[PDB]
Amino acid sequence: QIAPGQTGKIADYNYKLPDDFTGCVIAWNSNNLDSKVGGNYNYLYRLFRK
């Protein structure tokens, strides 16, 4: 959903890429860096928006 021309939860409520988007999306695994044994609830995620 970080690709232009897409409609989705993130694409509608958190991050919306333009249709005429010029640029690069880069993603890499970060469980060794952010995930915790007891649970890492430090990153939020938006569900509801008018």
Partner 1 sequence: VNQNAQALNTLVKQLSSNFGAISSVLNDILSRLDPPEAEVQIDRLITGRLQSLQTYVTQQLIRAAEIRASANLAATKMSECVLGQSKRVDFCGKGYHLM
Q: Which residues would be at the binding site for partner 1 (CB under 8 A)?
A: 5, 7, 19, 22
Smallest gap from Cβ 49 to a second copy, in A, equals: 11
Of 39, 33, 3, nearest to 19 by C-alpha is: 3
x/- map, 3-42, a second copy, by CB under 8 A: ----x-x---------------------------------
Does position 46 interact with a second copy (CB under 8 A)? The reply is no
The rounded Cα 2 to chain-centroid distance in angstroms is 7
Asked if 3 contacts 15 with a C-beta cutoff of 8 angstroms, the reply is: no
Asked if 21 contacts 4 with a C-beta cutoff of 8 angstroms, the reply is: yes
Question: Where along the sequence are the contacts to a second copy (CB under 8 A)?
Answer: 7, 9, 47
